[PDB]
Specification:
This is part of a larger assembly, with 2 copies of chain A. By secondary structure, chain A is of the alpha/beta class. Chain A has 2 domains: 1-53 and 362-406, Urease, subunit C, domain 1 (Roll), CATH 2.30.40.10; 54-361, TIM Barrel (Alpha-Beta Barrel), CATH 3.20.20. Chain A contains 13 helices and 18 strands. Chain A has helices spanning 78-86, 94-110, 128-140, 162-171, 187-204, 222-233, 252-265, 273-279, 295-300, 324-334, 340-344, 352-357, 381-387; strands at 4-8, 16-22, 25-32, 42-44, 49-51, 54-59, 113-121, 145-151, 176-179, 207-212, 239-243, 268-271, 305-307, 373-376, 393-396, 399-405, 408-412, 416-419. In chain A, the strands form 4 sheets. Chain A has an 8-stranded parallel sheet. In chain A, strand 2 and strand 3 (25-32) form a beta hairpin. In chain A, 56% of the residues are buried. At the A-B interface, helix 2, helix 8, helix 10, helix 11 and helix 13 of A face helix 2, helix 8, helix 10, helix 11 and helix 13 of B. Strand 16 (399-405) of chain A pairs antiparallel with strand 17 (408-412) of chain B, so a sheet runs across the interface. The structure holds fe (iii) ion (2 copies). One fe (iii) ion (FE) binds at residues 58, 60, 119, 211, 310 of chain B. It is classed as hydrolase.
Amino acid sequence: ALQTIINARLPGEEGLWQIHLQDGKISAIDAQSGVMPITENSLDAEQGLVIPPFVEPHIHLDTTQTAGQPNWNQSGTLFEGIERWAERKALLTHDDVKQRAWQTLKWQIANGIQHVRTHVDVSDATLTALKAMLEVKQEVAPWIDLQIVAFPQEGILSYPNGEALLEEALRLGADVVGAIPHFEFTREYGVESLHKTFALAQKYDRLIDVHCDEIDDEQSRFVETVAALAHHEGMGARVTASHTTAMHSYNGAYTSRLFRLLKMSGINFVANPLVNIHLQGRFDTYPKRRGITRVKEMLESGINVCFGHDDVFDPWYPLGTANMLQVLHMGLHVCQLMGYGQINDGLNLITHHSARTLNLQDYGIAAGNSANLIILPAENGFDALRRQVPVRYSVRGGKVIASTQPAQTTVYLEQPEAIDYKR
Amino acid sequence: ALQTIINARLPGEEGLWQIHLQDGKISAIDAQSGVMPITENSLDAEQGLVIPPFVEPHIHLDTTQTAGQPNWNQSGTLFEGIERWAERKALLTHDDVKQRAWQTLKWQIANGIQHVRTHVDVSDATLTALKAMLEVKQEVAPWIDLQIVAFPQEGILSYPNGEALLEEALRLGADVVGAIPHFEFTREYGVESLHKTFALAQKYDRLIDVHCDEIDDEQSRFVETVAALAHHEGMGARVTASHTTAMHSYNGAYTSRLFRLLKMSGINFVANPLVNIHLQGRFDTYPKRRGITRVKEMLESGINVCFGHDDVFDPWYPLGTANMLQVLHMGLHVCQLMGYGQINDGLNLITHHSARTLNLQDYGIAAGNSANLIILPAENGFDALRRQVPVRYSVRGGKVIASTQPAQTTVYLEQPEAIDYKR
Ligand SMILES: [Fe+3]
Ligand SMILES: [Fe+3]
């Protein structure tokens, strides 16, 4: 029965704020001139930062939690990962997918993530993972709004009945149409697959999220077709180009020309730091490229870009706890967004920009919006990122759905001293 | 009055182990065939991992904790960092250096680090930071063995009285002789500075740790002189080449030839992931090189390499909590040591290999050694790294000097559920 969040700091705002709640929504937001006393029905942010929930714009819940089953990827390569996944085929069932997806979703709830977009491989005639994920979506709805992308992993034109299966996935309820041009047999199939993807999105009124140019090939430019088609249909807001790691290898002249179109099209971009730094640059000896898309330049140009985890504890990425501040930390380093303001503003890459990517209509600490917000025990984005703080409280519909009692560290010098890693 | 560590897991060993303690030393280590009961004077590792303390082989305690004073580095560049540091000159006093060094040292104690090698800028006629650090070394001795490197930041031959000041630092007690060849005015001064560095190390019987080829210049090959001189003097074990980021840009043929000498010389290498990924590759547009030395290849060749944090909360690196598992996480990603075994064995890069780099004589969980060890609430190195676990207990001389009560996370679904991020 929470009525107020008090003593809240807000990004880009001075001072402390009080967030009033009513009927599961934010009724008003008022500045405070000092610290407010706690009381029944008040959740004290304790001068910590309050932001609208973290978002996971790109993850594969159908493959999550499978690392080491039955064997571990020892080389760490994409190739071996594919083989290790194949060895687990006998365990891939409806219940298995639901159990693993739920395990990661619980970690996400614990990490203040209330919006998740999962890709699901639909290059499977039985659509086993998709059927399982559609049930998971309904089951987790009280805690996470889950979007499902029908992802034609083996291609649309390069896989038997690929287009038919992609459309079947949409008819079953998938929220987003996926594609993977650079994986199609030819450049022509790649371009044609995008026309088919856009046609399906318009036919069913769905969003689009393409695994776009995820390859260190300076000639992989499917992103220009994604942006051009979006501009032509006037649907930029509903379109996302995931990865675009090839952009890391483009010459500057083409990239400059392309950026005009990217801005005009209004499409969204997702970079996946943890996985990109790991899987890109694998064909280089030395020097080795970083392989993340042009995040810094997109921000400078006002192009919406955000960060996803992509994989959690699977053959393609053995690590992760589904933590967005960890994803952000990696991205700030690899993209060299290390100035104070760049780091502080970093939270945008895992909150607001990701909400835009998911085309969310009810997101942000604003009057009238649902009371969905989280509290970080930190002074600002810089502090939260530097100390990799947990989510103190996650509030959804005005109710607490997760909480973390912080770790307590003590050093025993001449006298015991508490250490909080602040100066 | 601890007499035993029980239920301990050890890297590379099967099962649980009991570590007996007597007179501040490890008296014996015995395998257990099951879980042992707790009791008075027994520290229960609770099937967590027990390892010899984390080590910080490369940090600058003279510059730590100064970020944002008086202004923040907004571009994040090395150039601006130098300017921001210059603006703080009026605050650089004896007491200031001691206060800041101690602040970071407390974070290190909290993070299970009992061995630290700090570089101290001795291109200052007043040697202010060095005098302060020598007192800090004595003060922190009960918790951390601190090694001080006399670091001629502005060069030995390229700075007024550079050589005289370097020797004065040694006469005052600095443990290690530093150098920075690539920063000298000419290649010839660079090579000559190394001869002078080795001569001083032999004259005073000190270790050597060179800021070596920290630059994206494929022609910066001072590392071959460091290794050759060490081989000639038969002192490889006492010598360290820090950074060697230029090696990331060498052609493969030269690198292969060089590796024979690196192995034969027996010198140590320190990579500083967090700072290297941030400061290297700054002159590239796109693609952008990673800029970390050849860590993977050194491991494959049996060349001792380890990881340092380098900078903590300063103009050259605004982040950090002086956490070695965080440094390791970055290094595993950038160096693409992402296979299961590579990640699991990762702890070696922040424990044993770093101890070798510091030429430590009393390190490791072995009978006869001082009872210096830490307990991680994780099953193995992979688990500790993936979950970025805190140090549950840090034991020194058989006594607890630090402890962390873990954070407690709960998600409120149909029923409350504890989340520990394990599957
Ligand atoms: Fe993906
Ligand atoms: Fe350094």
